[PDB]
Amino acid sequence: QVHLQQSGAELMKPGASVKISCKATGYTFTSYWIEWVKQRPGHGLEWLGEILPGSGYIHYNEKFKGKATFTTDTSSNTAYMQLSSLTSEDSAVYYCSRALALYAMDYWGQGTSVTVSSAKTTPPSVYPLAPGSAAQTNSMVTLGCLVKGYFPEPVTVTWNSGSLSSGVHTFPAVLQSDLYTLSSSVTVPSSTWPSETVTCNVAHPASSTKVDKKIVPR
Amino acid sequence: FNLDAEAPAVLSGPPGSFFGFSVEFYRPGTDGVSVLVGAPKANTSQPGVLQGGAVYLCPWGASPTQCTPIEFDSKGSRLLESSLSSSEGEEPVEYKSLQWFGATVRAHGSSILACAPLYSWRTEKEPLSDPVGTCYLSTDNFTRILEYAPCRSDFSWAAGQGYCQGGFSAEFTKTGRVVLGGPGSYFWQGQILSATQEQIAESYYPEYLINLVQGQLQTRQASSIYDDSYLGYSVAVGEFSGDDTEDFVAGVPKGNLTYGYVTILNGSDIRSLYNFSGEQMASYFGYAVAATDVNGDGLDDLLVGAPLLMDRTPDGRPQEVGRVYVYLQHPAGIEPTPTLTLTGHDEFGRFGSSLTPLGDLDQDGYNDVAIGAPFGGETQQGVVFVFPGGPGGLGSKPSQVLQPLWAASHTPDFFGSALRGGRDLDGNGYPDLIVGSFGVDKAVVYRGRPIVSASASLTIFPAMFNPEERSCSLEGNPVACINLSFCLNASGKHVADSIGFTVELQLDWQKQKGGVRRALFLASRQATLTQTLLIQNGAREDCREMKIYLRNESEFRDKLSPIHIALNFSLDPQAPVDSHGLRPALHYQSKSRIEDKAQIL
Amino acid sequence: RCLKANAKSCGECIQAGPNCGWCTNTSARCDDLEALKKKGCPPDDIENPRGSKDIKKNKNVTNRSKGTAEKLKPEDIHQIQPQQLVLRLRSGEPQTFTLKFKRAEDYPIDLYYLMDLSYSMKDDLENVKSLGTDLMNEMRRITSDFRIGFGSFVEKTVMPYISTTPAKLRNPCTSEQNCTTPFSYKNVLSLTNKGEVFNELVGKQRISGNLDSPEGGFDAIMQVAVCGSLIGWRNVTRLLVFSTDAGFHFAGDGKLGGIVLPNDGQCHLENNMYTMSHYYDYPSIAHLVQKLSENNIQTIFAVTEEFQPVYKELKNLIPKSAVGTLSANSSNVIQLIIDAYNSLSSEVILENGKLSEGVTISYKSYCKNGVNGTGENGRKCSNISIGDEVQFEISITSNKCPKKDSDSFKIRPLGFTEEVEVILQYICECE
Amino acid sequence: DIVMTQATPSIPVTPGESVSISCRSNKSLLHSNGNTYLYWFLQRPGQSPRLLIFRMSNLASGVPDRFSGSGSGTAFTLRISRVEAADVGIYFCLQHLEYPFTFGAGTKLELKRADAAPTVSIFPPSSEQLTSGGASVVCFLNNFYPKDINVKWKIDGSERQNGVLNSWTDQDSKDSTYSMSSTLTLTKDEYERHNSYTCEATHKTSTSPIVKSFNRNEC
Ligand SMILES: *[C@@H]1O[C@H](CO)[C@@H](O[C@@H]2O[C@H](CO)[C@@H](O[C@@H]3O[C@H](CO[C@H]4O[C@H](CO)[C@@H](O)[C@H](O[C@H]5O[C@H](CO)[C@@H](O)[C@H](O)[C@@H]5O)[C@@H]4O)[C@@H](O)[C@H](O[C@H]4O[C@H](CO)[C@@H](O)[C@H](O)[C@@H]4O)[C@@H]3O)[C@H](O)[C@H]2NC(C)=O)[C@H](O)[C@H]1NC(C)=O
Ligand SMILES: *[C@@H]1O[C@H](CO)[C@@H](O[C@@H]2O[C@H](CO)[C@@H](O)[C@H](O)[C@H]2NC(C)=O)[C@H](O)[C@H]1NC(C)=O
Ligand SMILES: *[C@@H]1O[C@H](CO)[C@@H](O)[C@H](O)[C@H]1NC(C)=O
Ligand SMILES: *[C@@H]1O[C@H](CO)[C@@H](O)[C@H](O)[C@H]1NC(C)=O
Ligand SMILES: *[C@@H]1O[C@H](CO)[C@@H](O)[C@H](O)[C@H]1NC(C)=O
Ligand SMILES: *[C@@H]1O[C@H](CO)[C@@H](O)[C@H](O)[C@H]1NC(C)=O
Ligand SMILES: *[C@@H]1O[C@H](CO)[C@@H](O)[C@H](O)[C@H]1NC(C)=O
Ligand SMILES: *[C@@H]1O[C@H](CO)[C@@H](O)[C@H](O)[C@H]1NC(C)=O
Ligand SMILES: [Ca+2]
Ligand SMILES: [Ca+2]
Ligand SMILES: [Ca+2]
Ligand SMILES: [Ca+2]
Ligand SMILES: [Ca+2]
Ligand SMILES: [Mg+2]
């Protein structure tokens, strides 16, 4: 029953500001401090501050003085954190947890990612990856899909509805210049191509995009 | 109130013998009156029996030597038949050391019952330490001595009757039937066992340790959900059914999830008639039980002790005090909820510990009750309470408080832990009382005193002092006199026909502060007058007259304040000793001082 | 009231309570305020000098302002405020005040585990061999300073509670069943912070057995409460885990074995063994109530399902105690102890000391969510989780001038040694 | 202020073996309490951190006895007894004594395995992509161990390193291999000024590079 439910993923522009929430159930809100932690892709975990839902007792990591501001709402058992003057530094996943002087951070919320980009929504371009030569290291040929120029993060790749899942690699998306790029490889035994039909399924929700590329030889 | 607490008779027994653990009146027919005192830790001569316990016969009429132990059993413990000395034959079949003989002493007519609730025996079969307990009946002024151990049977272990300790409690009916409690029968369910004296004797064959008594009455074993009830932890008799055979009152203190209950069993067939449940967990409701009529209607009433009862002070502190519950029996039946509850004052002074019917102590046509707190009193020595019976139930306030006149020892006195009353040791038709102080090996005999109730009237004829109207003289001068009269009615049941009273009149009483006294007697020229009067038992208001004058002084200063007069009287504390050396007592509900004014105009 | 013949001298018409007055130069004389003084009475004459409230000592209830990084030393924590109020009181005029209680987050805990070791508890010993460490680990989730102790009990060692066969005195149980001889109370382990030690010793203890179903744990409980040093009690929160699968003997049962001298409430340990179970009776519930409440013992009754009815009831008569259902093999003790501790630590019950022969007291409680209390309930607040403040309104009234000194009595939450001195001064003279 | 150093950034462990994981401290985390205020957290991928050890040595509920904790005033190690696939993740320490609270950079724990050579494949830009004006050459390197590969790009014999963009997967659940994607991205007009594109993978299951290659004019 002890649970911390954080607000969904947010997409912001450089210089704006944002309000992240964390709701507490299963325990009495005003007896535990809420803890705020920042996780950057390459910078580990970072303690921001803490707040006791009762009275405005707050303790800040100085690095974030005037970057992060903390509030709580007793009537809705919700803690709040505000980020302001957003840059790329502020782009991260944010955790709320729970603490007492004696027992720190037993329970954690699910996380909230704040991405900060002056990039508008964009559908992904889906390009086939057929091999240059019929050159297989084994009885298995590799085929691919390149998915590039899209925003924001979520994109799913499927091979033939989902019928083919074994022998697939779909790679962490990367930042092309302000839009995302990723590709996906699929190993398939030689007999079933181009005998059978191999197609990649690319879904971008935040742009309502259904695109399929069948991968023809050459 | 009418007990000689001033100087009562103090018996005593061997040090550390628990002399006074149980107490009993004995009279073999008509007045060979003696007090019976159990002493269950006492040494005896019995061959190789450590502290077997004794019962002392204490003849009442003053003696050169005091109490001698009655001999119920001068033998050591019987040996085991199975092997007398076949290879390793030495073993006794019963264990009499530490058996606590004397823990319960009861008498009816010339019969005396004395039990040993820690008597244990090895069976004749596989060796056990079965504390079945035993009693010893002595019949017809010690003609014949009978052992009776109904729990020493063919069922031998906690699961049967082996741990019964039959005798732990005991009492006779009005016909001499023997009633026993055995708290430990059937995994401490408890058991009530009874037999008439003839049955016991019919079945007594000391060559065999097990004597099935025929026509014996026995509570039957119940299912294990009843284990650890301690039925028969205490016992009383009285008529609670319609008929004429006395019925059985049995304590069951651990009975209803350690809340207590008392049962009343049909004297005839030992079947269940009544249950009364305790109020508080582990209170020990049914620790002690009495049965006597306290209201008037010749119907016995139920009394229950729960000495461990804990209550709250007005300021919320919990404390252990003990509580006694009275259940009045009506022709309709008996009231399931009680009528009265009593509650001890002293912390840990276990109020409910013991109860005796005192008969009718103040001979006023109502039966009274005595209750003990063996740890009550200023120094934990112990205390007994006398509560008076009235028309509308037992009195909720004590007519007397008894406390030991000796100094506390290092160990607790347990004064009042055992009680027996409602019988007449001396001449007077006033019941008396034995209180047991086993902690210091003593028993105290209190005696009922003759009760005299009087009442005086005092009237001043010319209530106004008229200083100038002087219509009598003594010296040369005339003086203003007034007529004092006082009258005195006295009566008492077993008292002599003519009763001495001394009477003291005080004129200008409230002027006691060494000053001037304005009224004087014409006869003596003084302010006070002590006197003697002989009053007759059912006589007239016996009046006396006298003249008092105001001082011939226009010289004393105080002319405002009234002249106060005070008559007080008391039973003459001289010449009054009759059959047995015991002066009569004034009824506490009669005003022995009376006050009246006289004013100058 | 005063409308019925009351006039006397000085400190009497004055000491007749609320209304009555006497101006220093119809129905009754010394009777009213609005009917007496109504008929020709100047306000310079009357003598009605009354009682005051003096907050002589009240360090604020510890707040958590300094944060999760401050680790408050137990001596700095303050849960009850005031600490030393002084109350001047007149005969009839209530002098009420408020008490504030706050539940701090962390306090050191001594827990003593006292278990039935009779044959009925055969399988339970086995399971308990790892309890010392599992429980330490769990209890530390709730406290920075934890200590554990262990004690076993079986029974009074006399007729009729144990069988006194020479062979059964050495093995109370049957043929192949090994049993150590019966005993009253073994103090296996005085309080330590070393849970391995607990485990090492607990698996060295051998099972015993005896005759009658109920056991003599009340002999053990008493001894655990009253043997200060030998058990290891510190002035912190004190928990006694009493666990058993049978009923209990109490005062009056000793009589069966000739034990009739009441329990004395004093320590009698020698070699961590109770030496006087022959000599003193089992104590009465009331006695335990005194000694537990006097030594701040909070009692957890870990008993089996079949003895729930009896122990709930016992719980109802032991202030500041808890009861829980214990599995067959004691598989659930740990959860139990925590479940028990939570209720204990989330209710507060206010107990006062002895007053004088004409001084009464009222309690009113003001708990979370508007749930207010009156009377006996006025001293209770439940649902108090860490950090919660609650308030109690406490009135005292005296009847007439008792002593002419003071009664420095304490008001205290059961479990804590944190007291409130309430020094009373009585006003008995005119002016 | 207080700095937490976890010197080792990753440790490979055969499923079954036991591992110590260490954390050092700028200042001693021993209080007057006798309590050492150091914590230990594990973060499984795509999941929030979970508590493990709550005062130098003490275990959180649900954390199996395989995890033990110990250390001095300034040197703390966490041991795990029988490393499973479930214990794969990042292990963070934290100091809960002084503001601001400080984690070390984690230590990544992954499983050890038989060395394996990548399966390298290279794909030309598509016609689709050329129409739009861009050119991407994709090079997948697929199932290898150690997590420890290195790609050079070459055009017409020459090493280049400009429009290159690399993505790595995490250690695979079912088989403990790793994969890598490497992409050279040029303008279409720059892409037609050259004939041969080659990726060279330097993994140490081989001393010669693994070279797959595309030639624009080959037919
Ligand atoms: C005052 O309070 C007391 C105590 O609470 C009350 O006394 C109890 O009353 C109840 C209700 O009557 C008793 O339980 C019942 O007992 C009867 C009689 O038992 C005897 O007689 C049986 C037939 O003649 C006999 O079979 C019994 O033997 C059985 O048990 C023994 C020992 O356990 C064993 O050896 C055998 O194997 C037998 O099984 C015994 O001698 C009994 O017949 C009742 O049985 C009913 O219920 C059971 C189970 O629910 C069921 O199986 C039956 O079919 C039947 O329906 C019942 O158990 C209790 O024992 C009483 N006495 C005591 C001392 O506890 C009393 O009633 C109150 N008085 C008043 C006036 O209110
Ligand atoms: C006490 O027990 C006896 C039976 O043992 C009951 O006696 C019965 O009494 C009635 C009238 O009083 C007779 O008509 C029956 O014949 C009797 N039965 C026997 C077997 O003698 C008596 O009922 C019981 N007393 C009470 C009050 O219930
Ligand atoms: C009884 O006798 C024994 C053995 O002689 C002795 O130890 C004990 O003190 C005596 N007790 C009494 C009460 O006389
Ligand atoms: C009873 O027997 C005793 C001997 O113990 C004897 O002295 C006494 O006179 C007898 N009394 C009566 C009343 O028969
Ligand atoms: C036993 O006592 C309890 C507590 O008062 C009561 O509720 C119950 O009815 C009693 N049981 C019987 C059979 O009288
Ligand atoms: C009258 O009273 C006094 C004191 O109460 C007392 O001493 C005196 O003896 C009494 N006189 C009589 C005759 O009772
Ligand atoms: C706790 O406080 C009491 C009361 O002041 C004191 O007498 C006692 O010694 C203290 N106990 C301990 C174990 O320190
Ligand atoms: C309890 O007391 C407080 C303070 O007087 C009050 O605000 C609240 O309304 C009360 N609760 C109820 C149910 O009346
Ligand atoms: Ca009858
Ligand atoms: Ca009656
Ligand atoms: Ca009477
Ligand atoms: Ca007499
Ligand atoms: Ca037992
Ligand atoms: Mg047992």
PDB file of N, CA and C in Angstrom, chain B residues 237-257:
ATOM      1  N   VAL B 237     -23.017 -24.294  52.985  1.00  0.00           N
ATOM      2  CA  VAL B 237     -24.331 -24.965  52.909  1.00  0.00           C
ATOM      3  C   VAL B 237     -25.476 -24.018  53.268  1.00  0.00           C
ATOM      4  N   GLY B 238     -26.664 -24.312  52.751  1.00  0.00           N
ATOM      5  CA  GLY B 238     -27.879 -23.549  53.048  1.00  0.00           C
ATOM      6  C   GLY B 238     -29.031 -23.994  52.162  1.00  0.00           C
ATOM      7  N   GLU B 239     -30.252 -23.575  52.501  1.00  0.00           N
ATOM      8  CA  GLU B 239     -31.425 -24.011  51.744  1.00  0.00           C
ATOM      9  C   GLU B 239     -31.784 -23.039  50.639  1.00  0.00           C
ATOM     10  N   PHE B 240     -31.563 -23.476  49.401  1.00  0.00           N
ATOM     11  CA  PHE B 240     -31.744 -22.619  48.244  1.00  0.00           C
ATOM     12  C   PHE B 240     -32.721 -23.214  47.252  1.00  0.00           C
ATOM     13  N   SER B 241     -33.053 -24.484  47.461  1.00  0.00           N
ATOM     14  CA  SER B 241     -34.149 -25.141  46.760  1.00  0.00           C
ATOM     15  C   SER B 241     -35.387 -25.066  47.656  1.00  0.00           C
ATOM     16  N   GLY B 242     -36.500 -25.639  47.203  1.00  0.00           N
ATOM     17  CA  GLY B 242     -37.744 -25.622  47.981  1.00  0.00           C
ATOM     18  C   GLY B 242     -37.787 -26.492  49.231  1.00  0.00           C
ATOM     19  N   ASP B 243     -37.059 -27.609  49.208  1.00  0.00           N
ATOM     20  CA  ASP B 243     -37.198 -28.682  50.200  1.00  0.00           C
ATOM     21  C   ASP B 243     -36.487 -28.445  51.542  1.00  0.00           C
ATOM     22  N   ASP B 244     -36.010 -29.528  52.148  1.00  0.00           N
ATOM     23  CA  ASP B 244     -35.586 -29.519  53.540  1.00  0.00           C
ATOM     24  C   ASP B 244     -34.203 -30.135  53.754  1.00  0.00           C
ATOM     25  N   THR B 245     -33.604 -30.651  52.685  1.00  0.00           N
ATOM     26  CA  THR B 245     -32.206 -31.074  52.753  1.00  0.00           C
ATOM     27  C   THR B 245     -31.316 -29.921  52.302  1.00  0.00           C
ATOM     28  N   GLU B 246     -30.412 -29.498  53.179  1.00  0.00           N
ATOM     29  CA  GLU B 246     -29.512 -28.385  52.874  1.00  0.00           C
ATOM     30  C   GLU B 246     -28.734 -28.560  51.560  1.00  0.00           C
ATOM     31  N   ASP B 247     -28.620 -27.466  50.804  1.00  0.00           N
ATOM     32  CA  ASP B 247     -27.977 -27.472  49.484  1.00  0.00           C
ATOM     33  C   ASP B 247     -26.541 -26.951  49.550  1.00  0.00           C
ATOM     34  N   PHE B 248     -25.772 -27.173  48.475  1.00  0.00           N
ATOM     35  CA  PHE B 248     -24.319 -26.892  48.459  1.00  0.00           C
ATOM     36  C   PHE B 248     -23.898 -25.656  47.669  1.00  0.00           C
ATOM     37  N   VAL B 249     -23.147 -24.781  48.324  1.00  0.00           N
ATOM     38  CA  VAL B 249     -22.583 -23.598  47.682  1.00  0.00           C
ATOM     39  C   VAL B 249     -21.089 -23.830  47.419  1.00  0.00           C
ATOM     40  N   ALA B 250     -20.694 -23.755  46.150  1.00  0.00           N
ATOM     41  CA  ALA B 250     -19.319 -24.065  45.777  1.00  0.00           C
ATOM     42  C   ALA B 250     -18.641 -22.972  44.949  1.00  0.00           C
ATOM     43  N   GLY B 251     -17.530 -22.450  45.474  1.00  0.00           N
ATOM     44  CA  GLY B 251     -16.662 -21.539  44.730  1.00  0.00           C
ATOM     45  C   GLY B 251     -16.078 -22.195  43.484  1.00  0.00           C
ATOM     46  N   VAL B 252     -16.051 -21.436  42.393  1.00  0.00           N
ATOM     47  CA  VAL B 252     -15.443 -21.874  41.133  1.00  0.00           C
ATOM     48  C   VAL B 252     -14.694 -20.677  40.538  1.00  0.00           C
ATOM     49  N   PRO B 253     -13.585 -20.287  41.179  1.00  0.00           N
ATOM     50  CA  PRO B 253     -12.959 -18.987  40.972  1.00  0.00           C
ATOM     51  C   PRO B 253     -12.266 -18.773  39.628  1.00  0.00           C
ATOM     52  N   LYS B 254     -11.865 -19.851  38.957  1.00  0.00           N
ATOM     53  CA  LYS B 254     -11.222 -19.726  37.648  1.00  0.00           C
ATOM     54  C   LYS B 254     -12.151 -20.150  36.508  1.00  0.00           C
ATOM     55  N   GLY B 255     -13.442 -20.213  36.817  1.00  0.00           N
ATOM     56  CA  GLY B 255     -14.426 -20.914  36.006  1.00  0.00           C
ATOM     57  C   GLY B 255     -14.771 -20.402  34.626  1.00  0.00           C
ATOM     58  N   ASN B 256     -15.124 -19.125  34.531  1.00  0.00           N
ATOM     59  CA  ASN B 256     -15.661 -18.553  33.297  1.00  0.00           C
ATOM     60  C   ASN B 256     -14.635 -17.619  32.676  1.00  0.00           C
ATOM     61  N   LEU B 257     -13.657 -18.209  31.995  1.00  0.00           N
ATOM     62  CA  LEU B 257     -12.467 -17.502  31.539  1.00  0.00           C
ATOM     63  C   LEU B 257     -11.899 -16.649  32.660  1.00  0.00           C
TER      64      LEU B 257
END
